[PDB]
Design a protein around this nucleic acid. Structure first.
Lengths: 218, 203, 218, 195, 218, 195
DNA sequence: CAACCAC
DNA sequence: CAACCA
DNA sequence: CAACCAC
DNA sequence: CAACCAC
DNA sequence: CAACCAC
DNA sequence: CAACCA
DNA sequence: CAACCAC
DNA sequence: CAACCA
DNA sequence: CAACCAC
């Protein structure tokens, strides 16, 4: 019944039920089924830092597709593992991976890059807050850490990241669809990752999942 | 008066109109895990090489091209065969399932491949065909030609929606599954997969 | 009933009835309703001669549109008037307009032009047959004349052309649709007009109508 | 049914383009003139069958003549010589007639057996100062299975003929004023197998 | 419909349809759906030879289960690959793998073993026929070969075995079910494999599939 | 049974003995190039029927190329275009294909009505340093009964064709290195009676 | 067909 | 009969 | 039908 | 059959 | 035959 | 045709 | 089918 | 509770 | 929630 109605739907549009009615699940303005979108990747983290846009969703009929240019992201579910490489783990040290889920109210360009948005002493991600000028544009919705420790004879090779986070965030795109950061006219959810230890890196195998609904507004 | 339309020979039953072609020209990078592509992918529209309704009958598939080895791989002495399977998925959904999770087999070996015991009602193998290629330092068989015409009366039903996507197919979707017999090194397959179809008289 | 079924038809295709069944009106192979196409124009005729393609039909869903690249023209209905201009009609002379409805089995280019296909002595349209070499390519399906006579005090200012002609002719286009002579892959119906008198011209207000059906073949 | 009896090969065409200047005395031209050779539109042997003649074109009045009020029909006679010899014989000395009048033209008594009139047809043109019929269109196709023969030599001439030979004789009905005739005469023939 | 009837069947017995009726597919005596049974394995072949029983099927309600002690094997489908190991393939030689699908009308013990049934000169599998005395007991239903060639610079590493073979063979078990060669009271299908080259071995990754029906007789 | 319909006379031959140096790009040659004339091997009229083609010879690798460890098939396509204009088109602009690969080659979508592939045959050559297959023997007889037409002109050229015209397209399957093809293409034809 | 003449 | 429509 | 060309 | 040649 | 196009 | 499934 | 054995 | 599915 | 910024 769940699956049938979506396949047997009228050509270009959602099933009638969705159009009609509203679950308590869906936020204000927006309608339709809770569409998912996933970013599965092994991110190689550094001291300088890494970025990715997690609102990157293309436009289309089906599921995992925005319909219009506007849509509301209701929640983000980051899950996976951060870990040390087999040659690095021998060396005795510790590193926390700093995750910052930020929003930029006025986005453009390809990517902002870490340390060109976060102000910090000696390029240190633990002392990181938004820059004086960009403070208006960028806001940190969530931040969360994850520790990993190397050692010759005894090591903590890996750490499991599992973090659900609800953030009712409305985003607006261009007319053209590419599922790219460049296309976002309104705010776009960015995940910024940074390794606390200066020299050696850490890996982060992550599924970043994002849950969203299509906007009726405008 | 109204005479019934004498449907010409060499069009399928319940189908009429001109035979429409659809091509999927590509260099496929074949592996041991196995590659897939849907060959019933055709969009809905008034243009040529589009379907009109949701129903149409593929009458024949024509696979032609070449399997070949890279310049660094061809020096290494081995043999490997590409195993083509043209399978029908009767009741499809979602993304097209990978070669590993449709066919069951010992040690992910495509030569021992048959359809999984569980989902045997769903998938059927219409045609299978091999193609062997041999590496060698001084004397290699670098490449192998593929030329394979196969007549299959396959009636696909589509989603209401217009799109040339696999998710749309309601039933009898056509998948071409490919897999290399040798585990380590890969093989290239430059292929034109052509498909010859007729639109259904119904709807 | 006639009109309703065509408007209420399924989206991209003809009404079911046409698909099913075949009238005695429609030729072999082809199906569907008898689609018309009109070329209404005032042609200014000369001694050198004028050309137009009358199989120029674009591609589309509706009526006056070919569906596929192939279609069968069943009949041509040329109707209208040839006439003399108010300053020319004073002068005493006679001119017949020579109409040639020809078919070129292997067409290309923009237009062949008159006297580059018809061989004739002293550029004279009355002595006109197809050239020695092009004889294989071009065939004259119909030819027909129409006389007009000038005079100071007594004139025959105008003459009424009315000519229906059935010619079951199959034509094939490119994939692209422009309703242009250039697009015809197979034979295209050309109308060639020429004034018999050398010096002064004559006008020809013509509706050239063409009746055709869409091909099931190939 | 296409190719005639005793002859074979493709239907070869032969054309004659000319502005014939017509008179009351009468003009002649041999339409069976075709040369011998391996090329196209040539005869191969000395014998061939002319299946059909296609005369098409215009008969017209000159600009200084058309002002003068009169009428003239041009009489076209397509005739067969069964015994050609020397040069082509003139209109006046083949046909007999009252006072050189082409409308009364029939073949002379003595050589009535030699020449036969296969087809005759008229074409009228009328002058006039303020209103005129300057021109008229000729378009006569006629089928006449005519087997002709030539000498051992070749030049597409009336002198080289023997047995049958097709002459077109043209004559203007009005005495004083001349008229022009732009004519494509097109003969369709097949090479003989017999003899 | 196919799948539903088998799951919704009455407790201990086959669907009613099977009980009632008989397809042309099923052999004489026996009834019911065509039950499969698979033996997927990497067999390590030698000059001395290897054996396996391919009628090894246990007893039970479901599919891939015999119901009674008797059943008819209709066909065997051997498919897979024979191949040379990465260190062996360097050496220049050739070996054919000899497959013998034999039947022993009066089976007992754990396994008969190769060369204790096949008579051959100098333990050579190519010269192999059934022994003088056992000739009555054992019969070779099919034999088939497969060649593989080693070489330093140019090798034929592997060869694809694909062999369907229809052999309407009735077999009878003990009351107890173990899917073992020991349990066969009547004839049991045995596959005997042997490498033709004396010294080095070859591998054989094989799915041996067997298709059978349950007996109504006795 | 020997002479085709609408045709006459002796079965005239025409040969194209040549060493064709083949590439990945694709070579072409028109096999119905026959001159007009009274002589033997010439056509007489503008029309004739090619009954059968007999391709025979050898594809082979050069002495410096054969040492290099590789393989290539030579793809022969005997195509016919219903409409010939100007010079003969190159292999790439008739057949559409991925990466200019002749093993994927079918006729372009537009000119599919125009060009038809009558016969398609291959031949492999495998070069290696210490062991090789330098050459392969091509032998292929094939009946077709292709009626072709020409201009009034008399020259064995693709430009002079009208209606059907037999083109042999040849393409090496390997990208970089070339191969030779010593070939006798022998066309068997009869002169046409029709038209 | 043209008009006593012939195919 | 007129010209794809009854 | 138009005129050796083709459907 | 091998290829317009013949038996 | 080759592969929706033709003879 | 592939291999008990349509 | 494989090879005097059997179904 | 797990993570848009019951 | 994260940290003067915004929803």
């Amino acid at each position: 019944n769940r699956r049938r109605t979506w396949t047997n739907r009228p050509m270009y549009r959602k099933p009638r039920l969705y159009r009609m009615y509203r679950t308590p699940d869906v936020p204000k303005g927006c309608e339709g089924p809770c569409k998912v979108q996933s970013y599965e990747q092994r991110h190689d983290i550094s001291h300088v830092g890494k970025v990715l846009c997690v609102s990157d969703v293309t436009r289309g009929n089906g599921l995992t597709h925005r319909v219009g240019k506007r849509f509301c992201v209701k929640s983000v579910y980051v899950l996976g593992k951060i870990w040390m490489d087999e040659n690095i783990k021998t060396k005795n040290h510790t590193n926390t991976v700093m995750f910052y889920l930020v929003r930029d109210r006025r986005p453009f360009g390809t990517a902002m890059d870490f340390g060109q948005v976060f102000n910090m002493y000696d390029n240190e991600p633990s002392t990181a807050t938004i820059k004086n000028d960009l403070r208006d544009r960028y806001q940190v919705l969530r931040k969360f850490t994850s520790t990993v420790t190397g050692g010759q004879y005894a090591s903590k090779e890996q750490a499991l990241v599992k973090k659900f986070m609800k953030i009712n965030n409305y985003v607006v795109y261009n007319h053209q669809e590419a599922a790219k950061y460049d296309n976002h006219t309104e705010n776009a959810l960015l995940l910024y990752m940074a390794c606390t230890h200066a020299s050696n890196p850490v890996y982060a195998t992550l599924k970043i999942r994002i849950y969203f609904y299509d906007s009726v507004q405008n």
